[PDB]
Enzyme design. Structure first.
Site, mmCIF file in Angstrom:
data_model
loop_
_atom_site.group_PDB
_atom_site.id
_atom_site.type_symbol
_atom_site.label_atom_id
_atom_site.label_comp_id
_atom_site.label_asym_id
_atom_site.label_seq_id
_atom_site.Cartn_x
_atom_site.Cartn_y
_atom_site.Cartn_z
ATOM 1 N N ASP A 170 -4.922 2.929 13.300
ATOM 2 C CA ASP A 170 -5.023 4.188 12.508
ATOM 3 C C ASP A 170 -5.727 5.314 13.291
ATOM 4 O O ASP A 170 -6.766 5.859 12.855
ATOM 5 C CB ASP A 170 -5.741 4.009 11.175
ATOM 6 C CG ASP A 170 -4.950 3.345 10.075
ATOM 7 O OD1 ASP A 170 -3.791 2.904 10.318
ATOM 8 O OD2 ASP A 170 -5.553 3.216 8.962
ATOM 9 N N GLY B 287 0.821 -1.227 0.000
ATOM 10 C CA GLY B 287 0.000 0.000 0.000
ATOM 11 C C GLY B 287 0.844 1.262 0.000
ATOM 12 O O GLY B 287 2.072 1.182 0.241
ATOM 13 N N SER B 288 0.218 2.401 -0.281
ATOM 14 C CA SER B 288 0.873 3.732 -0.235
ATOM 15 C C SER B 288 -0.181 4.837 -0.307
ATOM 16 O O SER B 288 -0.612 5.175 -1.435
ATOM 17 C CB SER B 288 1.915 3.869 -1.318
ATOM 18 O OG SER B 288 1.606 3.046 -2.431
ATOM 19 N N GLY B 289 -0.600 5.327 0.865
ATOM 20 C CA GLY B 289 -1.258 6.636 1.038
ATOM 21 C C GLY B 289 -0.249 7.758 0.846
ATOM 22 O O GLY B 289 0.864 7.472 0.345
ATOM 23 N N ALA B 290 -0.592 8.987 1.239
ATOM 24 C CA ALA B 290 0.258 10.184 1.032
ATOM 25 C C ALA B 290 1.247 10.361 2.198
ATOM 26 O O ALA B 290 2.157 11.187 2.032
ATOM 27 C CB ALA B 290 -0.604 11.407 0.837
ATOM 28 N N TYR B 291 1.089 9.608 3.302
ATOM 29 C CA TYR B 291 1.909 9.686 4.547
ATOM 30 C C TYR B 291 3.077 8.684 4.513
ATOM 31 O O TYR B 291 4.017 8.832 5.353
ATOM 32 C CB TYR B 291 1.048 9.429 5.791
ATOM 33 N N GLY B 292 3.045 7.715 3.586
ATOM 34 C CA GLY B 292 4.146 6.746 3.398
ATOM 35 C C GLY B 292 3.804 5.590 2.468
ATOM 36 O O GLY B 292 2.679 5.560 1.905
ATOM 37 N N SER B 293 4.784 4.693 2.312
ATOM 38 C CA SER B 293 4.757 3.416 1.556
ATOM 39 C C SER B 293 4.815 2.280 2.576
ATOM 40 O O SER B 293 5.580 2.428 3.532
ATOM 41 C CB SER B 293 5.943 3.303 0.632
ATOM 42 O OG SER B 293 5.834 4.189 -0.471
HETATM 43 MG MG LIG Z 1 -7.337 3.342 7.943
#
Ligand SMILES: [Mg+2]
Ligand SMILES: CN1[C@@H]2CC[C@H]1C[C@@H](N)C2
Ligand SMILES: [Cl-]
Ligand SMILES: [Cl-]
Ligand SMILES: [Cl-]
Ligand SMILES: [Cl-]
Ligand SMILES: [Cl-]
EC number: 2.7.11.24
Length: 348
Positions: A164, A27-33
């Site tokens: 989270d 996965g990879s949101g904007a806060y990390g990989s």
């Molecule tokens: Mg979440």
């Protein structure tokens, strides 16, 4: 200091201790990989998160420090814990990268509801564990702020962990329209009515419990206003007592523009549910946050008689959040974070 090795995973350099093997992107949101890995020291399958741009601004440097402080504190069976934290840097002067290691969560709530049928006994056990974890979180004066099914990990044995935490992250675009990012939020935070506190998390538990019982989202609003109309149809329009606690004059004028409605009969909404489940929902889904049941009070409700053990519902060590009001430079936030990385002690 362990030996580190380097590799490129989807356009990114990863430099990690030799203990972590078979890294594979997840996965990879904007806060990390994030990569999955095997931890040869512990035998666990783990998630390794490489933060992105952790010290790029004062706001970002403080968020990095906040996340590391919160994850280092949380030591409870129903809350995500920190297995490891590392940097390849050998000094503060060459420090740029932070990596966080947790147990790999194989399934959220959503995954479990799609693949198995749940009885009333499952729902007693799932909601009991959320409340056991929240009793611990609230005892440290921490507010989660983002409880929803995708933030609850659940295994084959119906065992649950909260993850989270809300790091003050969510954008205006993310909360717009027909979106699960808003359907579990208390109305006082959704509409900025007043200074909110830990009671917002109990509203979210009521929304989650209702959808485990009916199989339908409780308040699937198409926008903020649609969602408020769905909420007030169930719980009733506010009385003079709550209207006085709403600090925005325009927020008060808007509510007073709506025709008055009474609270509905929850036995006629949650048709055929356990009467004790109906009673507990009526105590969580209260518009005035001062009058909601607390996590500690809910654990003693008769719905959880099969599971409640007041000698096995622990509270947290004290948590100092004085840094939240402190004005520092990027390099000062960066040094504080470095000290917290090097002082980490792993779990037993
Ligand atoms: Mg979440
Ligand atoms: C049918 N509904 C979908 C998935 C389960 C249920 C409740 C919501 N989480 C969305
Ligand atoms: Cl190693
Ligand atoms: Cl954990
Ligand atoms: Cl580094
Ligand atoms: Cl969700
Ligand atoms: Cl502390």
């Amino acid at each position: 200091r362990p030996t580190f090795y380097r590799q490129e995973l989807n356009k990114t350099i990863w430099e990690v201790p030799e203990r972590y093997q078979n890294l594979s992107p997840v996965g990879s949101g904007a806060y990390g990989s994030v990569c999955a890995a095997f931890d040869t020291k512990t035998g666990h399958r783990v998630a390794v998160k490489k933060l992105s741009r952790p010290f790029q601004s004062i706001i970002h440097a403080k968020r990095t420090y906040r996340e590391l402080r919160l994850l280092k504190h949380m030591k409870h069976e129903n809350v995500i814990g920190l297995l490891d934290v590392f940097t390849p840097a050998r000094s503060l002067e060459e420090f740029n990268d932070v990596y966080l290691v947790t147990h790999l969560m194989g399934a959220d709530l959503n995954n479990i509801v799609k693949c198995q049928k749940l009885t009333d006994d499952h729902v007693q056990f799932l909601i009991y564990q959320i409340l056991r974890g929240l009793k611990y979180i609230h005892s440290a004066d921490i507010i989660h702020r983002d409880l929803k099914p995708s933030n609850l990990a659940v295994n084959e044995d119906c065992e649950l962990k909260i993850l989270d935490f809300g790091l003050a992250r969510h954008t205006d675009d993310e909360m717009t329209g027909y979106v699960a990012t808003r359907w579990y939020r208390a109305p006082e935070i959704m509409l900025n009515w007043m200074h909110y506190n830990q009671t917002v998390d109990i509203w979210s538990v009521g929304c989650i419990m209702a959808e485990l019982l009916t199989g339908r989202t409780l308040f699937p609003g198409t926008d903020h206003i649609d969602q408020l109309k769905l909420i007030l149809r169930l719980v009733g329009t506010p009385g003079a007592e709550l209207l006085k606690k709403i600090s925005s004059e325009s927020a008060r004028n808007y509510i007073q523009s709506l025709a008055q409605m009474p609270k509905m009969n929850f036995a006629n909404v949650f048709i055929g549910a356990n009467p004790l489940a109906v009673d507990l929902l009526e105590k969580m889904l209260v518009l005035d946050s001062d009058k909601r049941i607390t996590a500690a009070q809910a654990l003693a409700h008769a719905y959880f008689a099969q599971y409640h053990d007041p000698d096995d519902e622990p509270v947290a060590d004290p948590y100092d959040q004085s840094f939240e009001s402190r004005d520092l430079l990027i390099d000062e936030w960066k040094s504080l974070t470095y000290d917290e990385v090097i002082s980490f002690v792993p779990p037993p």
